[PDB]
From a paper:
Based on the structure-function knowledge of the [name] A superfamily we have engineered a chimera that combines [name] 1 highest catalytic activity with [name] 3 unique antipathogen properties. Based on the [name] 1 scaffold we incorporated specific regions essential for [name] 3 unique anti-pathogen activities within the [name] A superfamily. The solved crystal structures confirmed that all the chimera proteins reproduce the kidney-shaped folding typical of the [name] A superfamily and thus keep the fold of the templates used in their design, as suggested by circular dichroism and molecular dynamics analysis. Nonetheless, the structures that incorporated the key features related to [name] 3 antimicrobial activity retained the overall [name] 1 active site conformation together with the essential structural elements for binding to the human ribonuclease inhibitor (RNHI), ensuring non-cytotoxicity.
Next, a second variant ([name] 3/1-v2) was designed to incorporate loop L7, a region characteristic of [name] 3 and shared with other antimicrobial RNases, but absent in [name] 1. Two crystal structures of [name] 3/1-v2 were solved, one free and the other in complex with phosphate ions. No significant differences at the structural level were observed, with an RMSD of 0.4 Å. In both cases the model is traced till residue Ala134, being shorter than its full sequence because no electron density is observed for the C-terminal end. As observed in [name] 3/1-v1, the residues Phe132 and Ser134 in -v2 variant have a different position than their [name] 1 counterparts, altering the B1 site cavity conformation. Interestingly, the R1-L1 (D17-R27) was hard to build in both crystal structures of [name] 3/1-v2 due to poor electron density map, in opposition to the equivalent L1 loop in [name] 3/1-v1. A close inspection of phosphate anions in [name] 3/1-v2 indicates that one phosphate anion is interacting with the catalytic triad. The other phosphates are bound at the protein surface, where PO4 anions n° 1 and 2 might correspond to alternative positions of the same binding site. Comparison of free and phosphate bound [name] 3/1-v2 structures highlights Arg 101 residue, which gets fixed at only one position upon phosphate interaction. Presence of a phosphate anion interacting with the enzyme catalytic triad confirms the conservation of the active site groove in both -v2 and -v3 structures.
Residue numbers in the entry: 0 to 133
Write the structure that this text describes.
């Protein structure tokens, strides 16, 4: 479950946005970057994608191409441009708290579900991404 102390938009950013990414080209990037996520979980997260772009550019996807969400509801949006991403996949020997990941950089269009900010989210960003849809 999402940790209740974080809004939907906050938890999306924690798990999926890394705008300060100079060690992402390292093979250890995922093992390092997943720690902060797994600290709020009871088992190593098996798979996780980070988007390596400035926050504003990820948020701006919410104003790009509207596409149907996998669940058929809400509002999802596909980035006009491909974005830098890193896919992180848990290794088979991993067992919490020792979570080791394979790091797989790439570039893809991202699809995000977006919605109005929570009251606890900054009012500077009225409409924000809350999930990946692909």
């Amino acid at each position: 479950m999402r940790p209740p102390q974080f809004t939907r938009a906050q938890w999306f950013a924690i798990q999926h946005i890394d705008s300060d990414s100079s060690p992402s080209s390292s093979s250890r990037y995922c093992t390092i970057a997943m720690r902060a996520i797994n600290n709020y979980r009871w088992r190593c997260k098996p798979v996780n994608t980070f988007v390596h772009e400035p926050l504003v550019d990820v948020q701006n996807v919410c104003f790009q191409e509207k596409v149907t969400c996998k669940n058929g509801q809400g509002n999802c949006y596909r980035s006009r441009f491909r974005m830098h991403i890193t896919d992180c996949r848990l290794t088979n020997g991993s067992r919490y708290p020792n979570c080791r990941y394979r790091t797989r950089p790439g570039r893809r269009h991202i699809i995000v579900a977006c919605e109005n900010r929570d009251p606890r989210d900054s009012p500077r960003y009225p409409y924000v991404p809350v999930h990946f849809d692909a």
